[PDB]
Amino acid sequence: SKFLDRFRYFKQKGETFADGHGQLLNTNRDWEDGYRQRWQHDKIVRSTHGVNCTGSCSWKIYVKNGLVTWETQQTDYPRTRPDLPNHEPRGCPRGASYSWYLYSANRLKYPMMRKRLMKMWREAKALHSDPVEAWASIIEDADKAKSFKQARGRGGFVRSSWQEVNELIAASNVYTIKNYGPDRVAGFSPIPAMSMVSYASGARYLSLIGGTCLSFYDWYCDLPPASPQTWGEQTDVPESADWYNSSYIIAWGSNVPQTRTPDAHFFTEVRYKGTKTVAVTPDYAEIAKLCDLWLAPKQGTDAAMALAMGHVMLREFHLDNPSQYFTDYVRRYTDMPMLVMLEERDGYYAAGRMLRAADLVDALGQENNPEWKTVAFNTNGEMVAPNGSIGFRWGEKGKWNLEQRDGKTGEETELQLSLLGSQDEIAEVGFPYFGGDGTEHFNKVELENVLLHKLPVKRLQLADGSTALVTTVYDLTLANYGLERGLNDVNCATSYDDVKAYTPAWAEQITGVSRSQIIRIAREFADNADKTHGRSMIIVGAGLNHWYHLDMNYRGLINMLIFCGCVGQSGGGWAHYVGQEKLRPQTGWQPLAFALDWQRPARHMNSTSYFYNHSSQWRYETVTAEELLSPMADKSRYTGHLIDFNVRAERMGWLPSAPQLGTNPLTIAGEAEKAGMNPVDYTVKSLKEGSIRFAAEQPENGKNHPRNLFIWRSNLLGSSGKGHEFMLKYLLGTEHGIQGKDLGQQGGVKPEEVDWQDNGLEGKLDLVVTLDFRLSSTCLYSDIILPTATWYEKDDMNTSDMHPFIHPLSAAVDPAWEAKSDWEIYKAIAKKFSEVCVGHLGKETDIVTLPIQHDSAAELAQPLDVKDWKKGECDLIPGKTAPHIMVVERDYPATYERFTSIGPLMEKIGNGGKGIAWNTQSEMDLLRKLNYTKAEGPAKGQPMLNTAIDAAEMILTLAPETNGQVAVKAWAALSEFTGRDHTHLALNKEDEKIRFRDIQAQPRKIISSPTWSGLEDEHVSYNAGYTNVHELIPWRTLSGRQQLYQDHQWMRDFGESLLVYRPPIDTRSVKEVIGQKSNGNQEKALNFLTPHQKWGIHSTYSDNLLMLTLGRGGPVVWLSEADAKDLGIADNDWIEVFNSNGALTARAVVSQRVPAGMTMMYHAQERIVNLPGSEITQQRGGIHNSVTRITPKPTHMIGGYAHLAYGFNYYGTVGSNRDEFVVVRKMKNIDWLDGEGNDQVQES
Amino acid sequence: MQFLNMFFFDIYPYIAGAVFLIGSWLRYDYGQYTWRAASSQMLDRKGMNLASNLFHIGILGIFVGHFFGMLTLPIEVAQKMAMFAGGASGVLCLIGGVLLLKRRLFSPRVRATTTGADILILSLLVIQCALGLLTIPFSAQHMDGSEMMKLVGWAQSVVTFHGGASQHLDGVAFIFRLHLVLGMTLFLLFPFSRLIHIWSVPVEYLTRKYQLVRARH
Amino acid sequence: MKIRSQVGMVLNLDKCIGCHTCSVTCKNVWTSREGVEYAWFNNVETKPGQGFPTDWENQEKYKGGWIRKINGKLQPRMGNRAMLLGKIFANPHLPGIDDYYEPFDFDYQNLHTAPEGSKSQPIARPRSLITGERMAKIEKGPNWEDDLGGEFDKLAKDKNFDNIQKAMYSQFENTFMMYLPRLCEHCLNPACVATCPSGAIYKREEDGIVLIDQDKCRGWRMCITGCPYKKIYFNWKSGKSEKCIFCYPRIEAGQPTVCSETCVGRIRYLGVLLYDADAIERAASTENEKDLYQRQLDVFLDPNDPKVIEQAIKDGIPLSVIEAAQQSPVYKMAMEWKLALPLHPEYRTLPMVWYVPPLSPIQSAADAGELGSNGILPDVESLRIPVQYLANLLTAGDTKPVLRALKRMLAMRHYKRAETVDGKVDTRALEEVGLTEAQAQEMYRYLAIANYEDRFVVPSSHRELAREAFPEKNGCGFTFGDGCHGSDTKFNLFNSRRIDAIDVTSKTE
């Protein structure tokens, strides 16, 4: 009795203490169990998150009362060396809030369908027993199709069933495939590393039926075109642990503590090791708070600083007092000693292509791919074609290595850098200079569009009779930076204060960063790299990579790292961290996701070009290739709209296409048989005759636009969708908020490769299906929503760039309500498809185009120039001057069987990637015991894939990264090419086999593999390029070395052969609309930046209440105090932001850390929470991408040329967005458009 | 009227009195978590300082008076005090009460987070206070203390268990009947409301050592 | 001389990345209920700023902590016992929900059920979690000033800017920001305990955790004012107050707190500290407030001194606790190296959660600078965060201990750079600050490498001593409602018995 206890008042009094200031009571404390029982749970399950953040953190999912209640980090990762800090606990605030989703009011519980589409679907089925025909009855009617396409994003969802929606989906896909082609069906799902199997589910189903898989690394602009350019590698960087090995680090456009949260401690802790840290951001970002120095250059001007620093370095560590380490490094690992041919001009020369062994008389002995082997001079004047050049990768074996040997005599021959001191004469070469152009918001420095420098050269006798002049990349490089070498150059600098081509004083003007600051850091960075042998590092992120000239910004930073020999050195290098693109078990996952175990090849497409076209954003282009042309280029040779360059690249086999042909590809075989010729040659003939055209040339003819789109693991229409308003208008056919006119209405010049029509085709997409667990913005505008399972309700695998562990995703409980895993959703759809397609599609023959692939033999396509077979400049030879033309067999009725089984191709042909190929039979035998096998049917005897685990197990067994057995065969295959032994990089792990249930118990470290250049050892951390430098394995580039000089035609003519400052472009999306729809409040033009937010990962978590409460409670934009006060904007005021492309609404965050001239809306806050109606469009306010628009860069389209060849996510147009300008102004009328009556009005 | 007389004044006071004790005892033993004053100040500070202090300081005046007045200087004197002393406390309590009731009913946050037991009890008190102030002009007619003698006589019979207490009342004005009825009803509803905070008045704090530490247990 | 144990906490502010992970995990586990949905036991604040609740550091307005009278005696700033009682009908100082933020939700269901034929895309607007009404606009949040979000004139109202000429900091080039994650201090002389009339708040003898007894609390809500750090939150639905409970359910088994184990920064340290309870009044009532810090370090006992060891044993401290104190990181950072400093020692509470001040980028200078006493690394003088600011926060306004901390941190860096880059032994910076090579390499071990087993050294609370573990093991958790928990008298009105107990006594003695 608690009542009777009070009577023991005095009896419970113990001793006092502190001289009567305290009393020790002996009272009951049972009440304390209250919190104890709250903490107690049913069990903990291990799992991670399937979101794009590179975190890849293992979590403990706490289940209590049969419900997921909360979660904390797993701290059991395999510990790093004793001298490096360990990874635990990792995690971030976003991840810690995931649990909120499982039962939140925003959870998608049942498959949903738009009421209008359902009503017409159910009436159509009451008239057409067969579903394909019921679909046809609706889609082929204008008033019908229109009725549901304009309902998009306008409420009206009604509960459906898996049964009803699976039929409609399969029906829609059969119709679409049988009446237009398989390539008119596509799916967009990104970053597979975050859930290998969840991505693979759709990718597999689409590949099986011949649909197109859209890229993402270039679409998001996470792809640094500079990487392929310099190393011929998509992306390969050191792990976050390696940062602790560096003694000098510069975070450049990388808000590490906010965007690389789980790895930030490596950066804060390496400081205690004596490492100096420097933050380079225009605003006082979180990254600044943890550095010893903070530099704030003008946004976009970064390449300027990089150039100046490169200057100081080349001057003080390569010229004045040379560095033994630096010199040997560039000598052996760069293309600097390589010879460049000089072209003729008017009184001056111009850098041309690189000299190839084929140009010389004897051809240097190299008779195999001589036109593909570079040349240089040795220390004894003798000319030579050293090993390693891409010419040795194919058609021969044993010379594709970076050993400093003669390609012909196989002897130890040292190469020489500068010709200075042995040049016949001194030629004057012109280099382009754009530092003088730019908009009004950036400082400029007038010099001359062309700068003449005096280069030391040598005259050589070409094999074809004539003669020309040559000079090393090293020479042009020193000339390009403006280093006075004693020939008395007027354009060369005499002191660091001299304002010439790329000096500290020069950059101080462009960037605004004191010249002395630049000189200091450059000196320190380089000094450190010298003392430690490359242990200097630069962490760069979207801060630089999302500008139209991301290439220049990066090559800027890259040359610095190379001049100090930091690449391939533990503790140094190029650390590019953006999206979670390092799906480590690559070669074991590709066959699963793209069904390469059954058919070959699959339909890959680069999303940027895809949306640029079908979203019809090219119809509003403002940028012209002309204004990007080099001053030293023949303008008349590069005419046409940007999209015209894409179309040419597509037919020259450079970039992929989708839809490919303007004619159903399943019928080409049925017409080639009647014509008496085989399908391949019948296509080459029809393409020449123009009887069969590339679909790209006529995107609006009603048969060359996608009709069915699957979206999963993406919020395309609310996040990544650059040109949100254009997508809503053209792809969806719904109300949009575009503000400008198009080329037609303005009367601009129409493309010379694509049909023009005044009224663009709208509502192209017939069916949009989105799979998600929460009702996102994309879902809101879809036709059918499929409730997918959360990351805590399904099994899958996850890996990252930051660490070498491959942990899992597990189900703490079965999916809630009617939800299903992405894998079970596509399996069910593949099942319903296989029965609905009966009598419509059978065993078909399909013609598939395939662009010249990088890492393949065909990458040695056009070596010296650019020949367009359509302009008659040469013959149409598929695989060389046009895409390959493949014949794929498709057993449509056996889709479901193939989807649920590992195909025969793994045994017949083999498996491989990145150039090599190995036998993988033993792996299949093992897989037959693990997954069991099919009893009968078309896949009888083949290993099974009924569940996600079966799939995960396939990935782990075939991948060399998770199976030491395969890892040895993989290093063996590459040893053939190199001629050096590499098996010793995996031998002592040969008996290692990672199992799904093994990693469920504890995350496991992977095995060193040729697919990557860093190592998985216990003595050295994973550093990108370490193998190239320490194993003498060549970079998949033309010269086999790190490319500093890009000699491809298009590169030379677009002034990108050597790095040069290129100011931020003008999109001209503000001047044509500012002031038009005035509301009475001052408007102003500001640079619109969108770094990634702190309260979400893209748009995920952006609707999550914990994140919304820790943030500002919805969409907001940051403005400087001046900009704000000048527009009469107080903190948290409703403001409007807009331009040609559209308008968005948000509340303002006024802050001192935002430099005047810019505004920031942290990336992804989407369109579903706390958004009022716009005064500019009279519609729901739009999103941050409502004011951006895609604008491609030509140099990002170069294909069929060694390291510049296509590859899914390897190369291709990127969707940059930081150059954008918007108009900001305070709002007046805050109308919510809900009919609630709760509207406000802001005064003044 | 005779049936309803012996009921309300010879029986009802023992029902409410039993329910009051055993009710408190049971909620104290099985309802610790529900035993609190239930502050609402944080949700709406406006006008609370004045209102609550008026209400409490007044209601307390009345309690001391009622307590020592009917459970313990001649009669006519005491009556003059009750009317002037207690009459003033009543005006304060009534005002604070009314202010608190206006708040609880029309102040968005307080009304959205309230329970019915809180509106009920507050309302009755305000009424019992108004009903009380109305007895003043009635006691006036008998400045000699004739009326007060009857009432105090009734009260003291009940608390000592001497039957026939409703007899002491013979004569008293009706208004007094009401006050005595509604009043006791509050003792009935006491244990099932917030009024339990009263039992907890923090007197022991005036002599407590500042720091408290609890041993293992 | 009464020795007692407590697990203190030290947060290395230099490593804090202002991520808030700590706050979210705490919120998920402890305060997701209606009534405390606005409470953030753990919360992070960006400084400069006024924090949460707004201006909690302003004791002149809020009345928290203790004051020292002229006669030298200690008294809660709220008032002596009678004064505090006179304020009970209405806490004249109590902070209102608005001082925190009005908790809100969103109508996501509108996105789902939006009817067919809407003139505009549906949307989820905010709703009050207190009233349930539509919200015109969200105007405040618990982390509203995150990352210098707000005009400088507004943030600079920070009480820690007193006695500092702040004009120069509104200039872009001089901008500076730091984070201050904070929980309950679990004071040695907690003001909360002293301001609760019902005496429902208390400090636990075995581990010094301060808890508000939910059975006993009567909701007088005076405690919220008494707490100078404003870490006690009134649960508006239950009527009782609630505060960080130092995750006692985990600490009892020897596990770190949730916000400690979940700290992405690896900045939180948990270690045992032995203190003389009998010295508490003495220390907290020292005349000069600039002495409270040092005076508190003097209440802590050396866990290796056998004099202390023998007294601790005599005083009830388990042997495992003492052993834990002997390898406690909290003790190394507060006593040995002097890197950790108390938060606002001037409140006289003897706070038990200390902080290592943060380093920052060098300030802006005319030129690119020169090589100082530490080479390319910074010199304490060149740090951009005004040290006086840090001192108003950690040392009652005295810049001496803060500078010593900063200088040693920097000292270590210099020593470590020589060793790992130059490959040489240079102790010039260590001698200047009074450290040795040994103390430096250890500092490095704990701060740089920070292995899990080093950041966390938490002993068991030994829930088996002075209690009856066996019957508890066998019958705890079965919550059928026996109505006998909470009292020591077995008699109960419902004629029942404890499930987790033995009622049939042994007759064999």
Ligand SMILES: Nc1nc2c(c(=O)[nH]1)N[C@@H](/C(S)=C(/S)[C@H](O)COP(=O)(O)OP(=O)(O)OC[C@H]1O[C@@H](n3cnc4c(=O)[nH]c(N)nc43)[C@H](O)[C@@H]1O)C=N2
């Ligand atoms: N919390 C969180 N983490 C994530 C993500 C997320 O959505 N949320 N997403 C992933 C993904 S997919 C990416 S691509 C990255 O996180 C992007 O982060 P990063 O810090 O590189 O870019 P950002 O664009 O944010 O830029 C970083 C900072 O650089 C500054 N900045 C911006 N523009 C410039 C510029 O032109 N030059 C220079 N030097 N700096 C500039 C700025 O301070 C920004 O915060 C990554 N992890």
Ligand SMILES: Oc1c(Cl)c(Cl)c(Cl)c(Cl)c1Cl
């Ligand atoms: O009811 C009473 C009240 Cl209220 C006062 Cl104040 C006094 Cl004095 C007496 Cl006697 C009675 Cl009965």
Ligand code: SF4
């Ligand atoms: S969201 Fe990414 S970074 Fe955050 S905890 Fe999850 S996996 Fe880690």
Ligand code: SF4
């Ligand atoms: S989790 Fe750690 S690093 Fe992140 S805010 Fe909290 S204390 Fe700082």
Ligand SMILES: [Mo+6]
């Ligand atoms: Mo990205």
